[PDB]
Symmetry: D2
Subunit: 424 residues, 4 copies
Amino acid sequence: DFYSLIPSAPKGRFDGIERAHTAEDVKRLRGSVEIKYSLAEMGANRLWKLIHEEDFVNALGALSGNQAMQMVRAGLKAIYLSGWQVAADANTASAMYPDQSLYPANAGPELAKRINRTLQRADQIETAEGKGLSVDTWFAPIVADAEAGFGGPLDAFEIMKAYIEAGAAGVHFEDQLASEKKCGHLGGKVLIPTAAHIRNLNAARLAADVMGTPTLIVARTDAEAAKLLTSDIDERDQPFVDYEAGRTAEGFYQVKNGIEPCIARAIAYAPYCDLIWMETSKPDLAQARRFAEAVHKAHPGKLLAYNCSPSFNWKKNLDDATIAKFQRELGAMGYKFQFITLAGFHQLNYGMFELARGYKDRQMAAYSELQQAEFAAEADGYTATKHQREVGTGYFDAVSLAITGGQSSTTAMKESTETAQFKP
Amino acid sequence: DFYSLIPSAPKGRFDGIERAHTAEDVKRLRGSVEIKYSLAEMGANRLWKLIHEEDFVNALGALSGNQAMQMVRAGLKAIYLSGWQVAADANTASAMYPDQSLYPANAGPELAKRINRTLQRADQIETAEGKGLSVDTWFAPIVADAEAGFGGPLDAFEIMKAYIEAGAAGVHFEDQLASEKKCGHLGGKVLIPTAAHIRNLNAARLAADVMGTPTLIVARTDAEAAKLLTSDIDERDQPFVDYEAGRTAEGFYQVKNGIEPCIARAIAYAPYCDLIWMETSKPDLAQARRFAEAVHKAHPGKLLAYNCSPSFNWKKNLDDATIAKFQRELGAMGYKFQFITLAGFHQLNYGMFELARGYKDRQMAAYSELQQAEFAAEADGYTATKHQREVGTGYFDAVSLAITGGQSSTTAMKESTETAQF
Amino acid sequence: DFYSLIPSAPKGRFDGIERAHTAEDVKRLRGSVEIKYSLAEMGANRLWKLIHEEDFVNALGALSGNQAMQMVRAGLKAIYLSGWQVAADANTASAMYPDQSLYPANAGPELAKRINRTLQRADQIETAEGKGLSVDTWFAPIVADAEAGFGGPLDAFEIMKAYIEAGAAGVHFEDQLASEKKCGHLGGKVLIPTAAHIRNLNAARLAADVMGTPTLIVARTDAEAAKLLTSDIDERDQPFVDYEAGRTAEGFYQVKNGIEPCIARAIAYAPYCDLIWMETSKPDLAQARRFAEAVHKAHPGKLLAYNCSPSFNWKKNLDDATIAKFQRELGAMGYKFQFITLAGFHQLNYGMFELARGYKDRQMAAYSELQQAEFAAEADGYTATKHQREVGTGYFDAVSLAITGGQSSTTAMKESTETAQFK
Amino acid sequence: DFYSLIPSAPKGRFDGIERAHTAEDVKRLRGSVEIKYSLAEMGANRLWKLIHEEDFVNALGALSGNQAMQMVRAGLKAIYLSGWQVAADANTASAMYPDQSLYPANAGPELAKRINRTLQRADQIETAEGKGLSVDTWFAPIVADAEAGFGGPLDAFEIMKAYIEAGAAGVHFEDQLASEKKCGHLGGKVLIPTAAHIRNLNAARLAADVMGTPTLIVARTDAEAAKLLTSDIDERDQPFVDYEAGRTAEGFYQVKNGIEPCIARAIAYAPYCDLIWMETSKPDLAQARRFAEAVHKAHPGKLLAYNCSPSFNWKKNLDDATIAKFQRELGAMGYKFQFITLAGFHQLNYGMFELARGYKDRQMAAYSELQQAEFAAEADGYTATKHQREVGTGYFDAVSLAITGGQSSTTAMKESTETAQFK
Ligand code: NA
Ligand code: NA
Ligand code: NA
Ligand code: NA
Ligand code: NA
Ligand code: NA
Ligand code: NA
Ligand code: NA
Ligand code: NA
């Protein structure tokens, strides 16, 4: 029934998934023509495959197309798209922001589109070279941050559709009040009622159904640390409300935080998402296990996601051996999607700071060192030292030669310095 | 006459500069109200001071605001905005392109705007912390790439204004055919006539005059390697035309390339620009000196720029001693603005490939190694390990506390893991 | 004191204005360099002057630059930038939306920037032709819709700054829950607490202070028709809460709507805004007078604003005589800014539907009818029939001639069909 | 061969079409995964059908999605996307420009996207209302302006792809130098060689091939009025070159302009496009007939396009009877696509200028006039007087109700003033 509305959806894709809406609602709200969303289809089906086939799927947050490309080239199988990074350095207000949903709601889907188009060029380049791809596929699924939905269920509906149009494979929504949204590891977090987040999630699924894509939905809870709640209207929340403490001047209720409300919320959200994620204060395998065991008593086999956050001081928290085994252990507990949210931001900022300091100190010696490290990384599959090829100069040369029946006088690669100075 | 129209311009700013237009043209084409472009003013004037006062001003191409921010944090005094990088990873078509002016003409100025807004937030953050700045200024001047002007002189005029509005300090224009534009170190370059590139330069100056800003103009010539030319109409170009070769199927003339047509074109361009740049095939200090000496014979003291290009294989061309002295030696010749065009692209792509490979193979050990290197770099001025502060969380906490008379329940830093674990 | 932080603010600009923050906060949050926002300064000051000197300033909602330009050419002295119209046909998601804050938060300021750049070209064209301007100024102040501020106080702060950078003269904010925002004339509105809307207004003022511009702030209340409220935490709202009815499933409180809670909120908002605006269900002069009288009792001389809404069926509500005098009466009560929100949308859609229907029916005859109507309007100051001049072709010719010392072979106007066929 | 690479192409679609590239080139340049461009396919296929089954397809230039929507509602079957209008009031530099390819190369396709998304919304609304559609389809094909391709063949290739991504059905390219592009009815036009324009056209076709869509390509020639030429390298152009006049200071050759070079260029372009278009200085049926006949002699049955330009002063050129039959006569000669380029601009500007003038004079009487005209137009299928429904408020209410299983408290239509006052 829903399978006939989402024809690319694989067998069993919606096992255990509940929807507030009917299949007739979907048809009534689809409009009258079939529009295909190819990259979203492929990405969602490949993600679904990967999380059921791998020990675990691990990703890094990409703030640019080029970043994503190198992740796939290095052999990673998924890309994470961080709202935090979007805020910091890649949003549609062209500003640097903290992670508080301050940027315009279109910014995340615009970055998803950029990432897919860079992966597309990479694919075109290798296809045109005629020797096979250097990766399994350039179209690694993107799991993308929709934050708190940017307001109400209609806002969640809209950003879900925008991510699908951009070609995202999975999207995550958290039970925070959008107007007070924070980074998971910042203070000042405000939860919305269990029912209200279930609305966001159903809105996301209605968006996917109407677009006709089996897009994955990740439900996130921020209840491990949050001590505020907008309303106690939901009886599932009331046991955690500290009534003696009274409301804040904003009218927020105050709540008991920790693993317990995370477990209750996750169990309530489970039927309305494909993966469940709980934010934590520390990289704590024991806590990760307790959460997974409690969810799995209610919902055996439910797939989980885990943020390996740069907001944790890793070696302050853990010894080298536990750090080394961390993701493998999490995978065996059922955390099949694991991501370093701010990997791109830290890599970009650290790397350019060190380059710039070296350059300041020793000028071209500092740059030659980077280039020599680039040459040495070629044995490991790095290609970008030859930057003209990397970005598609050779592909466009071939476009021009096809347009002109081989006759163009103005092709790029042949008399280039890349060709003359960058041979084996 | 032009000083009155550009109130911020410093003394001697326009010495030796000629213009095709008059001061009356400017008043006529400028509208009836005064609109200020404060970052463009501050930047141009600061770039002007720097290139005169320092031995040389060296820069790195920035593809994002965060990159520019660390460049300035590290002590660099200027930012280069590369069109190549705009094309690769930061354009308004959301596409990856080779360096051929394929992206929309607005993309460069949009990135200049991003960079200035990031620097703005950095300055806001430190200002609010109230212990003074960690740098001389966050507003390091931006020297930006306008490629071949993106078409005719009106296109050159428009991208110059856009860059002024975005807050660039200086903008470069090159004597290639915009519809066949290439990276200087690609083949297939086609030159335009000398006169035509002087129209582009004059378009750019008229834009700055009409905006009322003392924005710098950098004239680039691609004559060292280019073997094609659109038209032989300009007698100054005719001695380099290979009239024995005949025109190409497109109607292009074939020309004799090298240092000689570069010198001739430079000397012709010098009155219509502030700095002069010749693209080279190899990083060749002897060639650079020969160019500088020829230009300085006609135009003593003319400021020059130099592309320390990643499109060169540095260790293949040079020994370690020469690499080490390279920029210092260039500066002594008058190359006061020197820049590594693709620094940002190479840093970003190398750094992520290696992190991604480490992560695939060793998961969190590879990331914890990065974090540890970040902590180690703090002794030398790195701050970004503490990511919440870096992007302005403390600043926005301060804005909220002001709005609410100190009462907000939902400030972010106090109960953050950043405060607890860093 | 605050006048030093905002050098262009005229004498008396901030009489009666209270601020939650201090002058030191502003200096602390401003950054270290001086950046000028020239069109924002000019627009704010000119708007401030107009609303104190004119019987009333009336405007229409522009959904494009060309629209704005003809408003100014026609002799209107202000421009209204409608969020409804942004949603409908001019936003940064490139979608058609109903008026429910569904579009990205940057869209209105982006439209502000479009309007001001069109006006700038208008002014460049006429400056270059050398015979003076055909209007008092092309830079008619823009009063722009910031809706419910797109979230909490920091979002209000950010959209205010964005409108300032775009050159808006004034910005309005309303006491609705951003996440459930509606057009004032739709059902299902949810109010925020009086105090929370004061937080938004204060955010807006901190934004202007930090930018250093005397931008006008219009406080809007939607309490005439809104029957829902997020929280009863503010004692000021409690007299209007229906505690018998219970909360909805979302947890909203239900409230008793109408003029009374509008008056209470207006009086509370007054010290934190420059103009006050109450949405109404019907175009009613008597209710307008009641509101004005009550506000002026608490705050004598307070400037007010009034939405002459297309969401009203005008002839159903009012006779021709009342329609005719309607804005003049509002002016004498203190409604010094008055605006038809959806003016641009209705003229654009009606116009093109009728042209398209004529075209289907009669092809070129329907277009020629429009063209002759254009020629006839020239006697009343219309110019756009000569579309090449209108958009700046002669100005860019003059730029090319300046660049080429008069010698360019490729100027546009001399051999154009416009020069030959429109004499 | 090319039919398997473009699966949606109907039988005979590429009859007579030549390509410089091979089917193997397409496969090499296409990437390894199939990406679908649904609106581009449906658009192209419908346009192809319409131009073979209608006497002619007539369209108007839309500068906004709302304008396009009313054109489809009024019963027009295609939409024209004008670059001139993008320049004027709808581009990605947020500026007013003359028609000289000054705006960034992405602006046209961004507008194509807006137009198709508005049409999509109109379709969603009617589908949700369950009474069937009020039009044959909402997805009227868009014929879009690619100007001179914005540079070289690679720029043409890219703008073609972008238009296909935005859902355009057909795209037009002209044989002008992109760096000196003008409106066909401005002076200062510079042509490129016949060969160079053929490269642009093949670029466009390779783009469509690579995207896997049967997108229509319209070749435009500007040779009727152009007196300049970049290069005489192409022997096909040399008979029109006035060698005795010499070159201009820019290096341009000087050419004899008129019907003759247009005929030679069209005949050379024919195999590389689906429709041919000649810009003209006047709406001249005799000249139209002469061009059609000369083209049909070399290529029988070639479909043609004609610009019914507002740059012509219609009644100055023609009597009412010729105006009335103009399009029908063109249609019988083989001009199967006809378009009024600046219809959206002149309607938007005339309409707002007049509304604003009346508003200045008479305030709400002038708006009530518009609102009453709108009510009166409802008998002929106008609907936007009920603006809340028109932009999708009813549809989003239905979305909210589905999400919340009938329970939302905050739906908009029921308690709206539209429901109460526009019965
Ligand atoms: Na996030
Ligand atoms: Na927000
Ligand atoms: Na460049
Ligand atoms: Na180009
Ligand atoms: Na509004
Ligand atoms: Na919203
Ligand atoms: Na055009
Ligand atoms: Na151009
Ligand atoms: Na001849």
